[model samples]
Target: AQYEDGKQYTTLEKPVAGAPQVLEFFSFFCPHCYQFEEVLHISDNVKKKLPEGVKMTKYHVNFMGGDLGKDLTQAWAVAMALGVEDKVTVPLFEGVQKTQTIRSASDIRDVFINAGIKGEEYDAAWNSFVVKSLVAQQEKAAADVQLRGVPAMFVNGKYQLNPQGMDTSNMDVFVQQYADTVKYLSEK
Candidate 1:
């Protein structure tokens, strides 16, 4: 199902698509997610050749606790609202990938400030209904999806990585397989 712009409160019930949506659900603290970044980016390039409606949604799921969890929540809220994925996605991913540093919430906020988001708007969005719900959804997803690690990819909605029997190594091939799966499932 196509989620209402601000609706659809849970992880999707099943894969739904007019086009394949590659949603990567990840956590900043997850080592595996950090490692998966390269392969995922490869998948991203392949996604570009797909139909216009085919899109990528990278969700930062912060299930592990720490000041970092709150911070990741804040930063992603701002990023989503600001629509600056192309601007901040790589640097943020690299920061997490290269450093074993335990990022605090304030540290995450600092990254946003550095990225040009204003302090006031950032703070407000952090506490807004949408962001708070996003954090809550992350919590629920951890349990409902039985997630054990980060960098989980949901093809449309049905197939997922880090569990659920989906292979993670072949990015280009999986992207094709994922698109095909979405087509097959949507038809049925």
Candidate 2:
């Protein structure tokens, strides 16, 4: 990977504690995020290249209006609370972006149900106070970074990378740039 000292990515003024944190701030309603799935597919190849000790996390952006986004956000929070976000993420994205069928908590619940989640387990996770708290925390994290759009990537909670000026034609290169940047920062 070819990495320039300052041209490819920016360094944080005050480096966050986890120097190699790769956090993707996104929303289910974001079309660009849906498109980004081409790069972010849950397939092993995507995870296989990450440098050791670098952790990637996705925080749902909750600023979209109305209860639709709210309900989805709650579903996401519950998934995280139940330690099932990884399992449920793709389906949520598919349900919302492709089918246009997920519009409420009930719809979200059905997605979990189809994912083999038992009703009792779903109810417990959905109603858990921990889920609610996590949802709020995600919102605050997005706000703290002054996030103005979806599909935003934050390195170590400090360096924010958006797709602006990126060579969108070659998503592989775009994705590689991010991975290499994270690895470089981690090594530093």
Candidate 3:
């Protein structure tokens, strides 16, 4: 899981606007992505070690193309718009992957409600122009990568890592490798 020049990850043809960008493209329905969620808990120690100005962003994948995929993808964007992604991201994943309790927009609304966000607040964010726009933007950005699978990571606009490159049995190692790649690329 050590960082290696070129071998560990591939650099992008055109870097993103920010000097350092760490983007994680994922889907709530994807089991592998659900596992990767542990690394993206936001308040985790690994993220705390990121270089100054290095920001990690999450994009919900929409390649699945069904109603469920579309709904959940928009849910993530809405959660982000509400500024509760740090609070709801993981639980949402669990609701879908663990309990099979989250299936529709209403289900997601309940999750946010349980998290202490008011029902009206959730409804407003879910239906807002900003949330709708972000959902569209996320879908386009995910497609821009021509992603082969979920749980993909991009460091500074460069396609860096995916589940294929890691030992899925040990997610902690994957988290370390992911953080290391970001740190190394950000410094470069």
Best by lDDT: 3
Ranking by TM-score: 3, 2, 1
How much lDDT does candidate 3 score? 0.72
Estimated TM-score for each candidate: 0.65, 0.84, 0.84
| Candidates arranged by lDDT, highest first | 3, 2, 1
lDDT of each: 0.57, 0.71, 0.72
Error of 2 at 139 (Å): 1.2
Candidate 2 — number of clashing residue pairs? 0
Model 2 stretches astray by more than 4 angstroms: 1-7, 11-20, 38-46
Q: Once model 3 is optimally superposed onto the true structure by TM-score, how far is the C-alpha of residue 16 displaced, in angstroms?
A: 4.9
Clashes of each: 1, 0, 0
Global CA lDDT of candidate 1, please?
0.57
Off by over 4 Å in 1: 1-20, 38-43, 97-102, 141-144, 161-188
How far residue 25's Cα lies from its native spot in candidate 1, in Å, is: 1.0
- Which 10 consecutive residues of model 1 have the lowest summed lDDT? 1-10
Quote model 2's TM-score. Answer: 0.84
Indicate whether candidate 1 or candidate 3 has the larger lDDT.
3
